[PDB]
Amino acid sequence: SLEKDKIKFLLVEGVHQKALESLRAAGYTNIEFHKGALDDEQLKESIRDAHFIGLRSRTHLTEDVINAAEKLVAIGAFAIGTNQVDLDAAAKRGIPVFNAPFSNTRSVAELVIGELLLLLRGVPEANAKAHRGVWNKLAAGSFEARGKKLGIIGYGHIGTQLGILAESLGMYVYFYDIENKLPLGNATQVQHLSDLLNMSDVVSLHVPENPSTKNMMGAKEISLMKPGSLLINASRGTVVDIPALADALASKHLAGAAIDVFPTEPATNSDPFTSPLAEFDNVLLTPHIGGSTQEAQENIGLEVAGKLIKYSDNGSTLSAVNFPEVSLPLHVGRRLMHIHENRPGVLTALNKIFAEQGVNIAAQYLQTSAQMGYVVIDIEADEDVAEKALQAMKAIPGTIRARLLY
Amino acid sequence: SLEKDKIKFLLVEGVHQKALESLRAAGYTNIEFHKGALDDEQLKESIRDAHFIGLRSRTHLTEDVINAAEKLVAIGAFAIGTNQVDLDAAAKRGIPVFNAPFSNTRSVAELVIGELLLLLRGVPEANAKAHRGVWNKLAAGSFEARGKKLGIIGYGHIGTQLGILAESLGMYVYFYDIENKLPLGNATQVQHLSDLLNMSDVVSLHVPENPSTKNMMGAKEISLMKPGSLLINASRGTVVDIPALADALASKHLAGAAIDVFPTEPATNSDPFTSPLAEFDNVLLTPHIGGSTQEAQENIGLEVAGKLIKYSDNGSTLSAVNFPEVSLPLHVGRRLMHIHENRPGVLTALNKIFAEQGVNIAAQYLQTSAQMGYVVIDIEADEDVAEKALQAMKAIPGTIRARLLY
Amino acid sequence: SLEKDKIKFLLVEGVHQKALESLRAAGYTNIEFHKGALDDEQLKESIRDAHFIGLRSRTHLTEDVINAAEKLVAIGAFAIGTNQVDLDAAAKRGIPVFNAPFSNTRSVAELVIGELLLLLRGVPEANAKAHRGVWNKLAAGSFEARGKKLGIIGYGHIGTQLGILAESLGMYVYFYDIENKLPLGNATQVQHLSDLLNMSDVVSLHVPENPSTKNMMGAKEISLMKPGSLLINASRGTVVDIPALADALASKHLAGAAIDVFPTEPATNSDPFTSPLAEFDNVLLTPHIGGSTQEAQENIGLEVAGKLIKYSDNGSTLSAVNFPEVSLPLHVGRRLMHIHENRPGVLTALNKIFAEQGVNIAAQYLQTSAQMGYVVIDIEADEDVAEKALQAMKAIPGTIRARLLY
Amino acid sequence: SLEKDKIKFLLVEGVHQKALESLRAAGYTNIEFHKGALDDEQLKESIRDAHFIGLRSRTHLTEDVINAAEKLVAIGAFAIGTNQVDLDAAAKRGIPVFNAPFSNTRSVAELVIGELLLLLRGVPEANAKAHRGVWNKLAAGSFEARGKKLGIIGYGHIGTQLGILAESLGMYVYFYDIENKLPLGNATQVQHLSDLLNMSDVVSLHVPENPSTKNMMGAKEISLMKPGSLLINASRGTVVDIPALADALASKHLAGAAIDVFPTEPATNSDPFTSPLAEFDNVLLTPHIGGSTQEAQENIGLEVAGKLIKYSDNGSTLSAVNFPEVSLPLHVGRRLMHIHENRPGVLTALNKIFAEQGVNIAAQYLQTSAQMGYVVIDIEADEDVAEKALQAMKAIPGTIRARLLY
Numbered sequence A, B, C, D: 001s002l003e004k005d006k007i008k009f010l011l012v013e014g015v016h017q018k019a020l021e022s023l024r025a026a027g028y029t030n031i032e033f034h035k036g037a038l039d040d041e042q043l044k045e046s047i048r049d050a051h052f053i054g055l056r057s058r059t060h061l062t063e064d065v066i067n068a069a070e071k072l073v074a075i076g077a078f079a080i081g082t083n084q085v086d087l088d089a090a091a092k093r094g095i096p097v098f099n100a101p102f103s104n105t106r107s108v109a110e111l112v113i114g115e116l117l118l119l120l121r122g123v124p125e126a127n128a129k130a131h132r133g134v135w136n137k138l139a140a141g142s143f144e145a146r147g148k149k150l151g152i153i154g155y156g157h158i159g160t161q162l163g164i165l166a167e168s169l170g171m172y173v174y175f176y177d178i179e180n181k182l183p184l185g186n187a188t189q190v191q192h193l194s195d196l197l198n199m200s201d202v203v204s205l206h207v208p209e210n211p212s213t214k215n216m217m218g219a220k221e222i223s224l225m226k227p228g229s230l231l232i233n234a235s236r237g238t239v240v241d242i243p244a245l246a247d248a249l250a251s252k253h254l255a256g257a258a259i260d261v262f263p264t265e266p267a268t269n270s271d272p273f274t275s276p277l278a279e280f281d282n283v284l285l286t287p288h289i290g291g292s293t294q295e296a297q298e299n300i301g302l303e304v305a306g307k308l309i310k311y312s313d314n315g316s317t318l319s320a321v322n323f324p325e326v327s328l329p330l331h332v333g334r335r336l337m338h339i340h341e342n343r344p345g346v347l348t349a350l351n352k353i354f355a356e357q358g359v360n361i362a363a364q365y366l367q368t369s370a371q372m373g374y375v376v377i378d379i380e381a382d383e384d385v386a387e388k389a390l391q392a393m394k395a396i397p398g399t400i401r402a403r404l405l406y
């Protein structure tokens, strides 16, 4: 309450109000909120005395910005992505970076369901025509989704949810994953990708962005899809050979597609968009909105705020993307924490401080990345003894930062 | 087998092959099939010795055509509609007309589900832009369907199926119907339309075409919808005031819409299409395809063929749209039938024929519209006695037609 | 209202109150109700001026009783069975007999579910012991129902409901039926009975009582069941060779059983019960209560009352067990009905009455069993003309009875 | 492989074979298996060189037995209970004790479902009579489960599963829990117990054994149940006032009950059983078999074996019932562990060993109960250096035990 009032939370780019509700319910009310992106100079001014900052995709938390933030304890990327933030620079200063990598699984699943529905029915095509005054009711090849085969690639958080929704619509779900998984409902793992592609009326992609998925769907892979099928991609902009796809649409080997993500995307609603696909009416083209809904924002705000709250209240760095992960249950005494370089001697030095005072260490957890180490410490002591100890902890060769959580 | 070979079935406009499978399985193989619309003179030539004709929307079974068909027993409209066929002229000659009014409930339901999904997510709009090179990711007002309220108007065959699919997607279903109905799953009847319209995020229409539904959704009704909601219409082209709708889209009172049907529709894929709505990207415009899928055609072919088969095998006119409805279970003896004008005296005359011969009438069913009457008759007799009886039946004052089913 | 007050309904053996609610809602309030079985002399006195009687299993509607009932139009067996009623004697006097053959499908299904649950767990056995002071927790061979195979014999009204409940419990359902059927959920028809019996952990019987099911489960059939399995019978008391069953329990080829029905059952709660099975604690023995619940009584009361109401209001004999079945939709004019012996000449005579008066017969339906015939007749006329006509109808050689429904 | 062959696993009282499959799949094959309970002297002989022992309810792991086990690393109670094992004595020697507290949730849920089914239908009662030659079909008060209200007390692992099964049967589920919980399906938390008891047709108990649940259902609580309802208890033998219950059965305030657990239970199938309830046929009495099925044994064997495997492979004491809980993810280097008395100085001493050698501690986790502490340690070193270090670790004042996992 009286200590907490003094911990400043800088929220920019308009994170969801639910984030500020969590913050207040946890006793943190010292919040500077902005709907808009702070510019370089107004950012440097606002972050200067900020304990935490939550941000989105437009803010550039850069080495200099981070290096100028003089009280900064942690960073919250209220989004999935994290590239606007310099993870190493935050690391070096003992600043863990949190985010929300699966707060939007429902949004993406629905989008796919809706897309394959209309695609199977030649609707994006007829609808482009109708707005042009041409009326082309072409029913010969339209189908109902029920009874048909969905091929999911990437049976992860989104894939599994997709498969469930697809079963409610009466489709048969099949998936390919580089690792083996336990199916839900009547899903079915398929061993080689060749079989999936062959038998699927609809193939949808839910994989991550790395070298194994780069151009994963290319001319060869596409021509294994069954004639007249559909390809949907709302995963990552690098997973599909757009020009191969364009060919297979022009040759009518595929009856249509939907793409929500591209190799390069406009930075802003006011930049021009370019794609070979723009020429096909039977293709649905969406500006990276797969995970973009009000519900997704509510989730993101709740999660990431919670993480910041937890790290502040008890030091947990579980799921931090730039730090070593550590969490310790609450039990009586005082908790302290200490970040430092990963060198022989530190842990002892740290512990020594307590032994030589005859203080009982109740629990301790320490984890360590290539160059850094972080460690939480519970101890049975007076506030007096803790403070003094903090000081001594700060002194230890290799110490980056330390703190007395309570 | 030997009698049946001689009963000709004229199929035009390419009805589904399943129709010809039913026909053959029932022992009828004398089929003249055409994928295309026969023209007036080639129609008059093909129908001339045809016992049955199945057709679709393009054929004009007109008084003259019907009057020239010299052996025509019944007509099968392999479609929902029936306006290409002159019902009275068929009636007058004792020709019942069958059709398929609910073979496509799934198709329409899916279309709606797919449409409200993408509509809720501003997808038709972003996708029109993307094809124009403009990239407008506008997520502030996009929602997931789950948790939201669907208002169904017309809880009939399609409505009930819609409500079920919508519940699987996790929506709350509410419906308004001029008559009271038993809800499925967790549906909920709403008493006045005002409440439905007020609370619904999505309103979809599944009513018939008559004077009570004509312009049913007009400026007043639309402005009772909740701000930012969606209106979908895949029922009949007369149910929505297109210009009121256009206003409510231009004023952003509604966030979007989908319309599959219009007051006047192009006769052909090669005619121009016109609507005030063509100017809104956030509106989905589809060329009457609600019920247009391969599955729907399979159903239609199965149903209507079955009806023709039944009427031919046992005289049932259940669901005939231009005749009085009659059906009688099979039990031993000979079945005969007789169509005639609805006048005093006929039934007696008909029965007299059997009494005076000392023949036992086992069963009989007679139904009667304003001017016509139809009656099936089972009797315990020899083929010899039946034939003679048929003759006498033909003689009866007011007789239109008669037949000895077996 | 004024005519209806005069139609007496005699209800004995305490049918459910819902029966009297239907009766009153339909405008019939002249009801003599008895919770108890009327005895021969008090029955003859109460039925004497009764238009309808509803009864249960204890009343003996016999030839004499029926022959003494001087105003009796129809009989309602508020039960499944009908053997206390002399069907032919009722027939001869043109009295249709209704009943309720599937008002209790849920009750029987639940009973089976509950029984196989406890049987699989050796519970009836441990529980007989516990009440005797012996404590025998014998878990080696107890199983959960989930994952196990239920074999249903008789995939009829009860079978299908059973299969559904069993799937909710996570069992695999298989069925054998002498006729081919469309499975629900994931049920599975099995061709020969041998396969069903072999693979089933639990076999339950839901077949009718006739010569094909008599002793259907006998020593040979039982020894095809898988070792340690269970047999449940709540169908008919003649379907299982009780002594074969007794052997297979004594040899531990079967781990247990439940039987709700027997070749001969005590007439009364005060008669002694005898069975070879009484000696096995691992057998559940229930006194024909499969369909005995308050809900079942509510259904029975609603159905059978409805039927009586329908027959009285519009003459329908649909599902009558002793009459020829006939039903006709309502359309303007006056309805009359006529029961008579199945002889040449009657129908004409009947129709003649209307022709010679120049009255238009709007509809007519006539059905005919081996010796009897029943026929409903709509006609366009004045009340005056109808009455006179009724009289003439009564006159017709072979006439048993006639009536002017409205 | 070569090290693992030398780690002896002593399994007694016939744990499930799946336990030995897990053991072998993990590379541990040195197993001494016994279907039977070893007696004191044959136990002391077999455990003498045993690294682990798995046991059930009959074995008395006592201070002396434990103190004589000279190589004993951990104990596996392949059961829920743990009272045959002296937890403190195991603790003092740094022996964690594992068990399986929720491997049988399905078994107990099914038992309840089956019991309330037959109870609602007066079946245990009619069935006791039938075996005595008396036939009492008493249907007036029998009900179907569907539509009825189940009151669950203890919405824990078993409660939640129960509620799900009950919903599939079409019941309405309500629960009371001393803590607040998130409902599944359409369950419903009820605030005071008074409301639950009042509205429930069936009340079933799934709470733990402690002072708050002792005699929780007593005369007052029972008389709040609705007249004619049922009480089921398969939780703990101390939760229900058996004599109050007996009164409420004798007064017909309750229509029946099922009890699987008692204040004192026979030690053996050959001991006599005593209860006031034995006198009521409408009560189901089962010898503590709620969780007793073959599936439950498979679960128990899998879990507990897994835990032993984990503790042996990586030191995890997660869910140990007598130890402080600690778990650490795998990452390169050597893992060691150390149990010791909870005194100032130890951790430093331990760490010192590595610093002064210039060895980098990669991770460390330490947890601490009232008198004991346990700590796992990863370190970057040679096997040589690890061994030497182990030795030094063993030397530390207060050290109880230490080990070099790999």
Ligand SMILES: NC(=O)C1=CN([C@@H]2O[C@H](COP(=O)(O)OP(=O)(O)OC[C@H]3O[C@@H](n4cnc5c(N)ncnc54)[C@H](O)[C@@H]3O)[C@@H](O)[C@H]2O)C=CC1
Binding pocket: A080, A101, A102, A104, A108, A153, A154, A155, A156, A157, A158, A159, A176, A177, A178, A179, A206, A207, A208, A209, A212, A213, A234, A235, A236, A260, A261, A288, A289, A290, A291, A292
């Ligand atoms: N369109 C949009 O706005 C959004 C896109 N996404 C993206 O969707 C993707 C999936 O999302 P999540 O389910 O959260 O991912 P996840 O991590 O839960 O699942 C990824 C799955 O892919 C599998 N996998 C990895 N490489 C593979 C390969 N080469 N071939 C086959 N399977 C492979 C993994 O085993 C895992 O099951 C992510 O890339 C995420 O960034 C997420 C949210 C929104």
Ligand SMILES: NC(=O)C1=CN([C@@H]2O[C@H](COP(=O)(O)OP(=O)(O)OC[C@H]3O[C@@H](n4cnc5c(N)ncnc54)[C@H](O)[C@@H]3O)[C@@H](O)[C@H]2O)C=CC1
Binding pocket: B080, B101, B102, B104, B108, B153, B154, B155, B156, B157, B158, B159, B176, B177, B178, B179, B206, B207, B208, B209, B212, B213, B234, B235, B236, B260, B261, B288, B289, B290, B291, B292
């Ligand atoms: N877009 C397309 O290609 C297709 C459109 N349709 C049309 O959809 C409509 C509904 O189809 P079905 O479910 O088969 O109809 P249905 O006859 O089964 O149900 C119509 C329902 O509307 C109710 N109703 C009638 N007038 C009403 C009013 N004034 N206000 C509220 N409720 C009213 C009726 O009580 C009934 O439940 C029909 O007009 C059908 O022609 C059908 C197939 C395809």
Ligand SMILES: NC(=O)C1=CN([C@@H]2O[C@H](COP(=O)(O)OP(=O)(O)OC[C@H]3O[C@@H](n4cnc5c(N)ncnc54)[C@H](O)[C@@H]3O)[C@@H](O)[C@H]2O)C=CC1
Binding pocket: C080, C101, C102, C104, C108, C153, C154, C155, C156, C157, C158, C159, C176, C177, C178, C179, C206, C207, C208, C209, C212, C213, C234, C235, C236, C260, C261, C288, C289, C290, C291, C292
């Ligand atoms: N225990 C009790 O209190 C009650 C017993 N029942 C009895 O249960 C039986 C079934 O009830 P419902 O489902 O209403 O009957 P149902 O008539 O709906 O189904 C009977 C089924 O058995 C099949 N079948 C007939 N003979 C067969 C044979 N030889 N082998 C295999 N299948 C055969 C038929 O195809 C049909 O599907 C009836 O006998 C009924 O009287 C009904 C209510 C209560």
Ligand SMILES: NC(=O)C1=CN([C@@H]2O[C@H](COP(=O)(O)OP(=O)(O)OC[C@H]3O[C@@H](n4cnc5c(N)ncnc54)[C@H](O)[C@@H]3O)[C@@H](O)[C@H]2O)C=CC1
Binding pocket: D080, D101, D102, D104, D108, D153, D154, D155, D156, D157, D158, D159, D176, D177, D178, D179, D206, D207, D208, D209, D212, D213, D234, D235, D236, D260, D261, D288, D289, D290, D291, D292
């Ligand atoms: N009959 C048998 O063979 C078996 C009996 N059991 C027993 O069943 C009981 C429940 O099992 P689980 O679901 O695993 O327990 P659980 O620990 O998962 O749930 C116990 C629940 O009771 C609630 N609770 C505790 N005290 C309460 C009180 N005073 N009033 C209302 N709620 C209270 C807790 O909040 C918790 O939700 C345990 O005692 C277990 O030992 C378990 C297996 C077999």
